[PDB]
Amino acid sequence: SLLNPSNAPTRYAERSVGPFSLAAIWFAMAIQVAIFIAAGQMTSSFQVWQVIVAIAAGCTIAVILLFFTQSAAIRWGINFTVAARMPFGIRGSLIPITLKALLSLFWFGFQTWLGALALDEITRLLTGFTNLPLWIVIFGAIQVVTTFYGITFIRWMNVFASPVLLAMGVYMVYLMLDGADVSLGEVMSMGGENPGMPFSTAIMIFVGGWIAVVVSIHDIVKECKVDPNASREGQTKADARYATAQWLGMVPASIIFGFIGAASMVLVGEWNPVIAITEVVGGVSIPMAILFQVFVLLATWSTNPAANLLSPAYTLCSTFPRVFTFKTGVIVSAVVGLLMMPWQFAGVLNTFLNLLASALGPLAGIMISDYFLVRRRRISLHDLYRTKGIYTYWRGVNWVALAVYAVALAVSFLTPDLMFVTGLIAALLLHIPAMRWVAKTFPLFSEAESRNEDYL
Ligand SMILES: O=C1NC(=O)[C@H](Cc2ccccc2)N1
Numbered sequence: 394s395l396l397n398p399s400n401a402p403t404r405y406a407e408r409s410v411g412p413f414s415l416a417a418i419w420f421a422m423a424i425q426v427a428i429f430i431a432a433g434q435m436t437s438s439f440q441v442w443q444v445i446v447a448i449a450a451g452c453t454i455a456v457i458l459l460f461f462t463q464s465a466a467i468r469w470g471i472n473f474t475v476a477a478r479m480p481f482g483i484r485g486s487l488i489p490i491t492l493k494a495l496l497s498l499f500w501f502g503f504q505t506w507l508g509a510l511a512l513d514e515i516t517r518l519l520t521g522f523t524n525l526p527l528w529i530v531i532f533g534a535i536q537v538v539t540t541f542y543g544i545t546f547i548r549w550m551n552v553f554a555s556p557v558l559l560a561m562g563v564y565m566v567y568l569m570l571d572g573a574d575v576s577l578g579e580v581m582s583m584g585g586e587n588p589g590m591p592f593s594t595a596i597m598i599f600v601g602g603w604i605a606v607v608v609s610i611h612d613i614v615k616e617c618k619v620d621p622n623a624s625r626e627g628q629t630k631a632d633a634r635y636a637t638a639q640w641l642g643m644v645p646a647s648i649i650f651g652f653i654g655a656a657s658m659v660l661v662g663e664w665n666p667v668i669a670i671t672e673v674v675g676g677v678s679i680p681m682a683i684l685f686q687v688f689v690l691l692a693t694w695s696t697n698p699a700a701n702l703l704s705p706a707y708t709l710c711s712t713f714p715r716v717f718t719f720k721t722g723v724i725v726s727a728v729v730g731l732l733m734m735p736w737q738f739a740g741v742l743n744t745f746l747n748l749l750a751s752a753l754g755p756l757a758g759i760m761i762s763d764y765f766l767v768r769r770r771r772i773s774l775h776d777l778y779r780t781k782g783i784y785t786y787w788r789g790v791n792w793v794a795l796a797v798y799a800v801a802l803a804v805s806f807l808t809p810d811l812m813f814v815t816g817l818i819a820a821l822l823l824h825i826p827a828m829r830w831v832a833k834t835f836p837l838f839s840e841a842e843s844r845n846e847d848y849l
């Protein structure tokens with residue numbers, strides 16, 4: 394048996410996140426430093442308005458993906474890590490999941506670093522003392538302790554941060570434009586003096602940014618509010634209402650701040666607004682500096698925990714259920730996380746994000762396909778928490794599913810600038826015959842699936 398109270402499905406009565414709250418999480422979750430860098434470097438290949446469009450487009454494909462990847466977690470309250478057990482093995486799932494938990498972990502140490510940088514700047518602008526590693530640990534630690542309160546903290550922290558973050562950001566645009574004596578429309582076309590990159594791969598970069606979060610949203614949305622007595626059409630509007638809520642959360646947020654990163658680049662040559670606003674205005678008071686850094690901290694806290702730490706946590710406590718608990722998995726994830734020292738990763742993010750998309754495209758494709766197409770939303774919670782059942786396949790691993798991943802990954806390379814969308818579509822479609830083959834040896838359904846409601 395693989396069940397324990399932390400890795401258990403989330404009961405209808407235990408659910409706490411409705412459609413408005415999820416938007417309020419995504420809005421503050423999109424406001425984070427790394428989009429300054431991405432949208433900034435984009436000004437090299439396109440002008441600002443197109444970048445904004447590449448952002449809105451990439452945001453929209455992500456949501457279209459969310460509509461599908463979130464449906465099982467909302468309805469059934471389950472983990473990502475647990476949900477992967479279906480197409481891949483009960484253990485075989487650990488392979489892509491280790492890929493993904495690593496990715497997730499990489500991002501956690503990166504933003505903790507940016508967060509640490511901020512707190513260290515606030516202090517050295519008050520005391521000249523400038524030790525970063527201590528402030529690294531202390532922040533990593535602070536996130537852990539606030540992450541202990543799981544989605545309860547996350548949800549309260551993001552609703553109050555959201556408008557403040559929204560205001561600090563709208564303010565930021567005024568200060569630049571004013572102090573540079575430039576209208577909004579003028580800045581909207583100042584970029585793109587070094588073309589070469591296709592516009593499709595641009596969209597693919599902002600998609601590749603949130604690919605990890607979207608593919609494992611489960612860990613957030615298994616907490617969302619559901620009415621068990623809906624219907625096909627009421628379940629679908631529910632899915633759509635949530636997907637819509639995620640759209641209105643991540644788009645307007647990441648457009649305003651994407652624009653700020655781009656504007657910084659194009660006005661002053663740096664994606665970082667600290668520099669861009671400092672120059673344009675010719676220095677700023679110690680208060681108004683400390684402020685900016687309070688922003689960065691506020692912008693990191695609303696994203697890092699929820700997006701980067703939740704999912705490896707649940708991976709530990711659900712694979713080693715008697716060894717780890719949620720709270721302990723959080724401690725182990727944040728330690729490993731920082732010990733990956735990701736702040737030394739050579740290159741730029743864009744290409745990394747281009748890496749991330751074509752690396753998880755088939756994963757999202759195989760999960761959407763197994764649940765929606767092969768099984769028709771008809772799943773067995775019972776077997777997901779047991780070493781030997783209809784999801785065990787060949788001694789815990791479904792090699793055919795690991796094969797479809799490879800094959801789809803290959804075909805993906807045949808279309809480098811659209812890798813992700815070909816790899817998803819390839820994995821999606823191939824899972825169908827592959828699964829109609831495995832179904833001749835192993836069963837796709839189980840009697841125990843009638844105990845589903847016992848869990849809820
Ligand atoms: O999946 C993740 N986790 C992260 O921290 C980053 C956040 C991000 C950076 C740049 C563009 C979109 C999302 N992406």
Ligand code: NA
Pocket residue numbers: 421422423424425691692693694695696697
């Ligand atoms: Na944030």
